[PDB]
Design an enzyme around this catalytic site. Structure first.
Site, PDB file in Angstrom:
ATOM      1  N   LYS A 132     -15.441 -35.376  -7.678  1.00 20.45           N
ATOM      2  CA  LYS A 132     -15.085 -36.019  -9.232  1.00 20.45           C
ATOM      3  C   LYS A 132     -15.702 -35.389 -10.073  1.00 20.45           C
ATOM      4  O   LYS A 132     -17.031 -35.558 -10.123  1.00 20.45           O
ATOM      5  CB  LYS A 132     -14.510 -37.166  -9.377  1.00 20.45           C
ATOM      6  CG  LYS A 132     -14.091 -37.726 -10.624  1.00 20.45           C
ATOM      7  CD  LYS A 132     -13.170 -38.999 -10.549  1.00 20.45           C
ATOM      8  CE  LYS A 132     -12.410 -39.285 -12.022  1.00 20.45           C
ATOM      9  NZ  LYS A 132     -11.295 -40.366 -11.832  1.00 20.45           N
ATOM     10  N   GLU A 189     -13.796 -39.969  -1.278  1.00 13.76           N
ATOM     11  CA  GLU A 189     -12.936 -39.662  -0.063  1.00 13.76           C
ATOM     12  C   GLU A 189     -12.127 -38.690  -0.629  1.00 13.76           C
ATOM     13  O   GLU A 189     -11.671 -38.803  -1.668  1.00 13.76           O
ATOM     14  CB  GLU A 189     -12.220 -41.163   0.502  1.00 13.76           C
ATOM     15  CG  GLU A 189     -12.200 -41.095   1.921  1.00 13.76           C
ATOM     16  CD  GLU A 189     -11.223 -42.258   2.351  1.00 13.76           C
ATOM     17  OE1 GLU A 189     -10.304 -41.917   3.046  1.00 13.76           O
ATOM     18  OE2 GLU A 189     -11.574 -43.353   2.079  1.00 13.76           O
ATOM     19  N   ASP A 228      -5.445 -53.211 -11.951  1.00  9.61           N
ATOM     20  CA  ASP A 228      -4.637 -51.826 -12.179  1.00  9.61           C
ATOM     21  C   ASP A 228      -4.373 -50.787 -10.932  1.00  9.61           C
ATOM     22  O   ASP A 228      -4.897 -49.755 -10.890  1.00  9.61           O
ATOM     23  CB  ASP A 228      -5.657 -50.946 -13.339  1.00  9.61           C
ATOM     24  CG  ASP A 228      -4.904 -49.762 -13.809  1.00  9.61           C
ATOM     25  OD1 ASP A 228      -3.663 -49.755 -13.912  1.00  9.61           O
ATOM     26  OD2 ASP A 228      -5.413 -48.680 -13.883  1.00  9.61           O
ATOM     27  N   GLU A 247       0.137 -43.801  -9.092  1.00 11.59           N
ATOM     28  CA  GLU A 247      -0.849 -42.721  -9.525  1.00 11.59           C
ATOM     29  C   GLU A 247      -2.156 -43.029  -9.211  1.00 11.59           C
ATOM     30  O   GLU A 247      -3.361 -42.112  -9.016  1.00 11.59           O
ATOM     31  CB  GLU A 247      -0.945 -42.236 -11.184  1.00 11.59           C
ATOM     32  CG  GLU A 247      -0.761 -43.324 -11.954  1.00 11.59           C
ATOM     33  CD  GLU A 247       0.599 -43.706 -12.446  1.00 11.59           C
ATOM     34  OE1 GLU A 247       1.341 -42.884 -13.148  1.00 11.59           O
ATOM     35  OE2 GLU A 247       1.050 -44.678 -11.895  1.00 11.59           O
ATOM     36  N   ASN A 248      -2.543 -44.432  -8.889  1.00 14.41           N
ATOM     37  CA  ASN A 248      -3.664 -44.886  -8.387  1.00 14.41           C
ATOM     38  C   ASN A 248      -3.635 -45.311  -6.882  1.00 14.41           C
ATOM     39  O   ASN A 248      -4.672 -45.718  -6.144  1.00 14.41           O
ATOM     40  CB  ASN A 248      -4.332 -46.173  -9.152  1.00 14.41           C
ATOM     41  CG  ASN A 248      -4.843 -45.837 -10.217  1.00 14.41           C
ATOM     42  OD1 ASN A 248      -4.774 -44.810 -10.811  1.00 14.41           O
ATOM     43  ND2 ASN A 248      -5.591 -46.761 -10.860  1.00 14.41           N
TER      44      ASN A 248
HETATM   45  O1  LIG Z   1      -0.993 -32.848  -4.834  1.00 13.93           O
HETATM   46  C1  LIG Z   1      -2.055 -32.847  -3.996  1.00 13.93           C
HETATM   47  O2  LIG Z   1      -2.004 -31.637  -3.494  1.00 13.93           O
HETATM   48  C2  LIG Z   1      -3.183 -33.644  -3.799  1.00 13.93           C
HETATM   49  C3  LIG Z   1      -3.555 -34.693  -4.609  1.00 13.93           C
HETATM   50  C4  LIG Z   1      -4.553 -35.574  -4.345  1.00 13.93           C
HETATM   51  C5  LIG Z   1      -5.257 -35.424  -2.917  1.00 13.93           C
HETATM   52  N1  LIG Z   1      -6.167 -36.464  -2.478  1.00 13.93           N
HETATM   53  C6  LIG Z   1      -7.063 -36.950  -3.388  1.00 13.93           C
HETATM   54  N2  LIG Z   1      -8.035 -37.272  -2.720  1.00 13.93           N
HETATM   55  C7  LIG Z   1      -9.202 -37.978  -3.475  1.00 13.93           C
HETATM   56  C8  LIG Z   1      -9.041 -38.018  -4.641  1.00 13.93           C
HETATM   57  C9  LIG Z   1      -8.005 -37.513  -5.468  1.00 13.93           C
HETATM   58  N3  LIG Z   1      -6.840 -36.887  -4.574  1.00 13.93           N
HETATM   59  C10 LIG Z   1      -7.857 -37.468  -6.741  1.00 13.93           C
HETATM   60  C11 LIG Z   1      -7.268 -36.222  -7.474  1.00 13.93           C
HETATM   61  C12 LIG Z   1      -7.009 -35.832  -8.603  1.00 13.93           C
HETATM   62  C13 LIG Z   1      -7.481 -37.000  -9.667  1.00 13.93           C
HETATM   63 CL1  LIG Z   1      -7.304 -36.778 -11.089  1.00 13.93          CL
HETATM   64  C14 LIG Z   1      -8.220 -38.227  -9.063  1.00 13.93           C
HETATM   65  C15 LIG Z   1      -8.234 -38.585  -7.822  1.00 13.93           C
HETATM   66  C16 LIG Z   1      -8.908 -39.670  -7.405  1.00 13.93           C
HETATM   67  C17 LIG Z   1      -8.510 -40.843  -8.244  1.00 13.93           C
HETATM   68  C18 LIG Z   1      -9.485 -41.519  -8.649  1.00 13.93           C
HETATM   69  F1  LIG Z   1     -10.868 -41.260  -8.891  1.00 13.93           F
HETATM   70  C19 LIG Z   1      -9.243 -42.791  -9.591  1.00 13.93           C
HETATM   71  C20 LIG Z   1      -7.695 -43.268  -9.475  1.00 13.93           C
HETATM   72  C21 LIG Z   1      -6.993 -42.416  -8.812  1.00 13.93           C
HETATM   73  C22 LIG Z   1      -7.229 -41.191  -8.322  1.00 13.93           C
HETATM   74  F2  LIG Z   1      -6.289 -40.414  -7.608  1.00 13.93           F
HETATM   75  N4  LIG Z   1      -9.895 -39.862  -6.240  1.00 13.93           N
HETATM   76  C23 LIG Z   1     -10.431 -38.724  -5.304  1.00 13.93           C
HETATM   77  C24 LIG Z   1      -4.657 -34.748  -2.253  1.00 13.93           C
HETATM   78  C25 LIG Z   1      -3.726 -33.756  -2.386  1.00 13.93           C
END
Ligand SMILES: O=C(O)c1ccc(Nc2ncc3c(n2)-c2ccc(Cl)cc2C(c2c(F)cccc2F)=NC3)cc1
Length: 242
Positions: A33, A82, A127, A131-132
């Site tokens: 991030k 992660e 929260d 999306e979380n």
């Molecule tokens: O569509 C795909 O191909 C896809 C999308 C996501 C993943 N996996 C993944 N893994 C870890 C994180 C994220 N996404 C992620 C991705 C973007 C953003 Cl803006 C935030 C995060 C976050 C996050 C966070 F910090 C707070 C709250 C919610 C979160 F989702 N955390 C790390 C795999 C495939």
């Protein structure tokens, strides 16, 4: 102490962007991030992030997304998170419209577990929302403005406790089964009135077993909401979970 030189940045996944990354020495796949210190200092929520990282990296649960570490560069602040390969529950939800009862029960169970662990560590989340919610490689749930998920006691500014996450769990159970949150509206104003009046209805396809659990979780009075143990023992969760 980490540096940007240790990571190979990959595809975008998302006050900034979240990238796929690979740590060079170990080849370990992670989500990195990226947040700019400008926006963080302009919002002043750097202390909120200082505390948030202090909490997130101290917790260990299979249903809570892991924060491995962090570090800051010239103008950026990096979070070594992660990686959940199967994406967000929000993407799965709009790609499937609704979830069947067996998928709903398992997520709810995994949530109730992750929350019961948080509540035993004196952490109230407040929260959760699709999306979380992220999905691991096995498909397991992982916990990582708009009013839809907030309880009446919260939006009315009153004192609140652990029961806040029980309301949210009701809102999420409804959304999983229906495709939309129980108090959704076109304006923040209408939504506020709908939450405070606790006014929601069930579509015909929603079973009485689901209706019962949701109606128990969506009580206006926090005290009347079930404990997480009761959620995990509900007949509807029993019959449909994993
Ligand atoms: O569509 C795909 O191909 C896809 C999308 C996501 C993943 N996996 C993944 N893994 C870890 C994180 C994220 N996404 C992620 C991705 C973007 C953003 Cl803006 C935030 C995060 C976050 C996050 C966070 F910090 C707070 C709250 C919610 C979160 F989702 N955390 C790390 C795999 C495939």
């Amino acid at each position: 102490q980490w540096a940007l030189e240790d990571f190979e940045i990959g595809r975008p996944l998302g006050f900034g962007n979240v990238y796929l990354a690979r740590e060079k020495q170990s080849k370990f796949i992670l989500a990195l991030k990226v947040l700019f210190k400008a926006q963080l200092e302009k919002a002043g929520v750097e202390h909120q992030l200082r505390r948030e990282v202090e909490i997130q990296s101290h917790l260990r649960h299979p249903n809570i997304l892991r924060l491995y570490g962090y570090f800051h560069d010239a103008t950026r602040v990096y979070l070594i998170l992660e990686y959940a390969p199967l994406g967000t529950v929000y993407r799965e939800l709009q790609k499937l419209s609704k979830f069947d009862e067996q998928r709903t029960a398992t997520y709810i169970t995994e949530l109730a577990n992750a929350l019961s662990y948080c509540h035993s560590k004196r952490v109230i989340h407040r929260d959760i929302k699709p999306e979380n919610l992220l999905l691991g490689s096995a498909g397991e749930l992982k916990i990582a403005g708009t009013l839809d998920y907030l309880p009446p006691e919260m939006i009315e500014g009153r004192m609140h406790d652990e029961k806040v996450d029980l309301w949210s769990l009701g809102v999420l159970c409804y959304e999983f089964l229906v495709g939309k949150p129980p108090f959704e509206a076109n304006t923040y104003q209408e939504t506020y009135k709908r939450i405070s009046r606790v006014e929601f209805t069930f579509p015909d396809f929603v079973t009485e077993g689901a209706r019962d659990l949701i109606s128990r979780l969506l009580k206006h009075n926090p005290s009347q909401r079930p404990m997480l143990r009761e959620v995990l023992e509900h007949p509807w969760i029993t019959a449909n979970s994993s």
